[PDB]
Paper text:
The site of mutation is not within the RBD-ACE2 binding interface and, as expected, the binding affinities for both hACE2 and mACE2 binding to BA.2.12.1 are unchanged compared to BA.2. In the mACE2/BA.2.12.1 structure, the critical interactions made by Spike residues R498 and Y501 with mACE2 within patch 2 are conserved as in BA.1. Surprisingly, compared to BA.1, R493 of BA.2.12.1 forms an alternative hydrogen bonding network with mACE2 residues N31 and E35, instead of Q34, that now forms a new hydrogen bond with Y453 of BA.2.12.1 suggesting a plasticity in its interactions. The Spike protein from the more recent Omicron BA.2.12.1 and BA.4/5 variants, containing respectively 1 and 3 mutations in the RBD compared to BA.2, retain a strong affinity for mACE2. We further observe that Spike proteins from Omicron subvariants with significant antibody evasion abilities such as BA.2.12.1 and BA.4/5 still bind to mACE2 demonstrating that the SARS-CoV-2 virus can balance both evasion of the human humoral immune response and its ability to bind to different host species.
Numbering used by the authors:
A (entry chain B): 333 to 525
B (entry chain A): 20 to 615
Amino acid sequence: TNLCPFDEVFNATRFASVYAWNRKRISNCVADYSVLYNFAPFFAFKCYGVSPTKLNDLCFTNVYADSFVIRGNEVSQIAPGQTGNIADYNYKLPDDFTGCVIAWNSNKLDSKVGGNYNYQYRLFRKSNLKPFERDISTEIYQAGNKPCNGVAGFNCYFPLRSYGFRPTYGVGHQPYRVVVLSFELLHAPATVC
Amino acid sequence: LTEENAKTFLNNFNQEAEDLSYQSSLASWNYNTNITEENAQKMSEAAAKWSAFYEEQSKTAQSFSLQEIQTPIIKRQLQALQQSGSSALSADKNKQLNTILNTMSTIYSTGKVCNPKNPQECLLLEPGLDEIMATSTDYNSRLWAWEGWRAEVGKQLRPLYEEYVVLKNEMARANNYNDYGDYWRGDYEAEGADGYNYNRNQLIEDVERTFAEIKPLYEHLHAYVRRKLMDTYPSYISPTGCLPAHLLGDMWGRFWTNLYPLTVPFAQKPNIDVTDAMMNQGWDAERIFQEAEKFFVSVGLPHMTQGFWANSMLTEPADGRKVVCHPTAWDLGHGDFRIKMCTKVTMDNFLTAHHEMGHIQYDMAYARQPFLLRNGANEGFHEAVGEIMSLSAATPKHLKSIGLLPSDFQEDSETEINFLLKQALTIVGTLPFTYMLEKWRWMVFRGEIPKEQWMKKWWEMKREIVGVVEPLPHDETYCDPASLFHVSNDYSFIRYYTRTIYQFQFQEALCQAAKYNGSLHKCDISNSTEAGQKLLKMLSLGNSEPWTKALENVVGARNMDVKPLLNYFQPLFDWLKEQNRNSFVGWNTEWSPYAD
Ligand SMILES: *[C@@H]1O[C@H](CO)[C@@H](O[C@@H]2O[C@H](CO)[C@@H](O)[C@H](O)[C@H]2NC(C)=O)[C@H](O)[C@H]1NC(C)=O
Ligand SMILES: *[C@@H]1O[C@H](CO)[C@@H](O)[C@H](O)[C@H]1NC(C)=O
């Protein structure tokens, strides 16, 4: 009996931030995707490249689980070929993506009276990200041609802003936990299924 | 650059403004529903923080040229942040203004009058004098409450209003405006294209042109009402005279809807006031707000959110905490919509459930616009959305589908006259009052009236425009206009004038869109999804377009048109003409309660 760690990426006490997402490399395990349906209500389960039916004759060399926490209005940005603040400065997906996303509402855990400022996102990067790039650097962003030296003002901005989640917002501005699974078939012969 | 530095400046302003303006509304909500000495302090602190942020961000934005190098929407957003609001005042002047406003609000809210027989028995304005002035029929009972209200709080409100006017005129002078009235009239300015233009000084000539074709219709209604009141009060009524102030159905005379029982045309026919049916069938405050949601869904508009049923008040909380019962619709931000209202089981509180839910639907529609463009296209557009819903909800046949009228109810000419007279008692009866009050405030703010002639000019304009006499004369110490809630709380009052024209223009447009053939006062746009998208396309615009273009999108016009209003009351104009065949239409200003 060798189960696969699908409760250490789905049942964690606290997730990461959007700009500093966690990547976990699953290998050497027996993948039981049925337990993924243990939650049952899913805000989104659209799956790209493969079939949701999970044909049993499918073996993969490696699996990557990327986890973070966004708003409800930004879930549609986690898809191949989109644009916005999350798919340009925080988390980018390749156009040839193989794998899929799972999002679910998390208002009872990540919302606090007075605000929850533990979740941050990036704004003003000056350049779009490339697929699967993290970029956790924090430096003052200049928009004009006047140098900025450690002072945030007029045309000098801080790139990181907080969500400040509160209860009683509404589905659009309410916490949503997202985990994306990617499947890799490396050139080496497959022995892990 | 400029245009490329403006987008990054607004993207930084927006996310700070949406977060720093949400906790100032959540403090006002917590104060208005709890009322203590801590919630008031929290509200003051949050308001101070939000004002400081805005005053810092408004002077920074006044360095972006704007000659002509930009896109339209960015230009509209930047031309709205360059106003500075009321921050032009210094610290001392701002503190004085806040102190005066708070004092006036507290005095008005806590104002009470005590029974002369029992000094320990005192009644407030809301559960006290309002019921007497809305349901009593005795001359002495109605006069006493009126006199006491005008003699206790109104006389106390006089000294503060002088400094209030002085400071708010100075702040308007600082903001490149002649006076504060012109500041209030600056909401009607549009600049988005050629032909779609307007000027804030054109408002006064149009608001006067429109109040020329309407007064002939109002005079016959006044004649009929005074003819009925003469039978009601044979002694204190003169046929060649003006109506007494306290005998108008309310404390001021805003709505004559409470005069329907006295002046009902045909008593034998079933009543249009379905209060008794609501009471008997077992209707609570939740059913009133559930039958007013099935109306918006049928016409093709979204459901109410789930944070509206669990967060709204919708009924007086009883318990021990004090609440403000003035109906209000709150848009706290971040998708939070609420309604505060002390609902009771009456027809008047039933239609009011459609007016305030019509603000939430309008707020829910332009929530996709940027932060600075989330407002009604005009200050009179926002109050004209609930009214067109209340017009359809009040028809005699819409009350049969929901069961408030018998299944064998028969509709004929008598029912038409009943319905039209009841509707005109509320809509026509408020227009002269609104126009006169706003005109008086405009004349005072522009400094065309001396400080020693306020009340004398007030009661002199009343009996030349409105037609209401005063029972007892008032000296220069008396401050009568300060009695009104809007006057003492710094609110504009001209919205309720253009509202009553935009109302009928929108109603006729929606009736034509719904493919309805017949009279206008029997529209009932319910169960029509093709008249719910024609409005929604206009509601979902906000300030992103000039109000002239927004009006043209729906009614095909670029200005106010009073012809749609006249078709609504056409069957009532005639009957009033024949019913006044041998009556002297008009009032006498020279008449006075005292001799000579
Ligand atoms: C209404 O306001 C009062 C006073 O602020 C609240 O009573 C106190 O609330 C604070 C926190 O807001 C508590 O720490 C105290 O223990 C409360 N005192 C008592 C005697 O309960 C009251 O809770 C508010 N009502 C609400 C929020 O429904
Ligand atoms: C997550 O862990 C809790 C704690 O035991 C458990 O009740 C729940 O079923 C788990 N959910 C999963 C594994 O999806």
